[PDB]
């Protein structure tokens, strides 16, 4: 979707000159002026977006989008408008206010690939502004034409840059949450999205995953319409991809899905997702590690038979590892994973947790400046003592917590300031210790 010049004299034009040319009654002079404008808006640094808007050029550019007889000016103005729309919400608004949406949607059917591609790009920028413009683009009927552009036997016959553009614009139509995209628009888009999720290009796969992650971020009903399409196995596969740009959105999508129902969570387990976590929980990239632990916490919050799966895959030692050493935010997710595990696990599963060495690292964290994680941890111990109570082992556990220095940190918290904390402590103290 890219261009040139007439460019000895279309480079570095002044805005007054551009206005002069566009105001001439000459289509060719307007074309030259529009290209000059595009070049100012397309330069490497500080494009004069506001100056162009103030000159009142948008309405002219929009009208040039409809000049089928001069494809070059359609393309140049489409590019100019695209770059104005790439700015602030206010700059994107000016483009919308000029009536650009229906004009760009009309250009989607252009016989010229580079022109329909620019139209796609522009709509991506407009929809990317947020919920309102996203939904306005949809109301103008952008989805059908966009989907038609991908209606081919094999995606591979499409120009690579062209396909990446369509995928990205489609993902923005699935983006944002207050409100989320119209249910029927999501249903209309899903089938094509599933197809892109199986394409071989790394950027198309990444953005496809991001779109899926957007769609799974919300009520269980939204998660269900995605899981229903049977994409989980594919998401699990991409979860093991070598490229971080693909793994990140794949893990996010998987993580959103396990925040749903036990039935929906069971789907990721059935697909074999847990076998990838030994690697995800030790990933060099700290964000992956964080999201992986976060995902584990929503799985340990599941059924006992699901917690057992976590056990069978040998993931408890990995949780003990993250709890012992990791970026603090990851350690916080681990604490949650542990408290959720102890909250719904069987006595045997909880005993196992202690046998893996969860106690010491858990106590060492009680010394963190984060009342939230502290509550979570004290809460975890309570659940663990309760398991040892049903075993008349409440004493062997007290020693352990005393051995590693736990008590010397719980009593100190007993004198905390947050009622939730000092109360929780005191209770544990007088109930299990001295």
């Amino acid at each position: 979707m890219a261009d040139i010049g007439s460019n000895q004299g279309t480079v570095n034009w002044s805005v007054e000159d551009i206005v002069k040319g566009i105001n001439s009654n000459n289509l060719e002079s307007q074309l030259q002026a529009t290209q000059a404008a595009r070049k100012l808006l397309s330069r490497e640094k500080q494009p004069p977006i506001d100056n162009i808007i103030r000159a009142g050029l948008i309405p002219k550019f929009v009208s040039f989008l409809g000049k089928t007889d001069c494809s070059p000016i359609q393309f140049e103005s489409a590019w100019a408008l695209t770059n104005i729309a790439s700015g602030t919400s206010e700059q994107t608004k000016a483009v919308v206010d000029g009536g650009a949406i229906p004009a760009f949607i009309s250009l989607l059917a252009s016989p010229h690939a580079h022109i329909s591609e620019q139209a796609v790009w522009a709509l991506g920028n407009i929809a990317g502004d947020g919920s309102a413009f996203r939904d306005l683009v949809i109301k103008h009927g952008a989805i059908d034409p966009l989907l038609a552009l991908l209606a081919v036997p094999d995606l591979s016959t499409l120009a690579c840059g062209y396909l990446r553009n369509l995928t990205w614009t489609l993902s923005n139509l699935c983006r944002n949450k207050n409100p989320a995209p119209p249910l029927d628009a999501v249903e209309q888009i899903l089938p094509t999205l599933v197809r892109l999720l199986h394409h071989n290009d790394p950027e198309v796969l990444a953005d496809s995953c991001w779109a899926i992650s957007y769609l799974t971020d919300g009520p269980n009903e939204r998660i269900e319409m995605v899981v229903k399409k049977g994409v989980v196995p594919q998401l699990v596969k991409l979860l093991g991809a070598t490229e971080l740009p693909i793994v990140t959105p794949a893990l996010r999508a998987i993580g959103n899905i396990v925040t749903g129902t036990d039935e929906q969570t069971q789907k990721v387990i059935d697909a074999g997702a847990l076998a990838v976590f030994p690697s995800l929980l030790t990933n060099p990239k700290t964000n992956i590690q964080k999201e992986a632990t976060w995902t584990m916490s929503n799985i340990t919050a599941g059924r006992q038979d699901q917690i057992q799966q976590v056990v069978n895959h040998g993931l408890v030692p990995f949780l003990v590892g993250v709890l012992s050493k990791a970026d603090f935010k990851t350690q916080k997710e681990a604490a949650w994973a542990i408290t959720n595990y102890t909250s719904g696990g069987t006595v045997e599963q909880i005993v196992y947790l202690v046998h893996c060495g969860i106690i010491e690292p858990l106590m060492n964290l009680l010394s963190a400046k984060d009342t939230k994680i502290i509550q979570v941890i004290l809460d975890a111990i309570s659940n663990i003592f309760q398991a040892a109570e049903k075993l008349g082992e409440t004493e062997k556990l007290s020693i352990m917590i005393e051995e590693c220095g736990g008590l010397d940190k719980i009593e100190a918290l007993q004198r905390h300031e947050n009622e939730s904390v000092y109360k929780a402590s005191l209770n544990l103290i007088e109930k299990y210790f001295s």
Partner: peptide, 15 residues
Amino acid sequence: DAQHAAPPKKKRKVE
């Protein structure tokens, strides 16, 4: 590779 952020909300065409 690249990693971390979600795709840009808007993209300006430099070329």
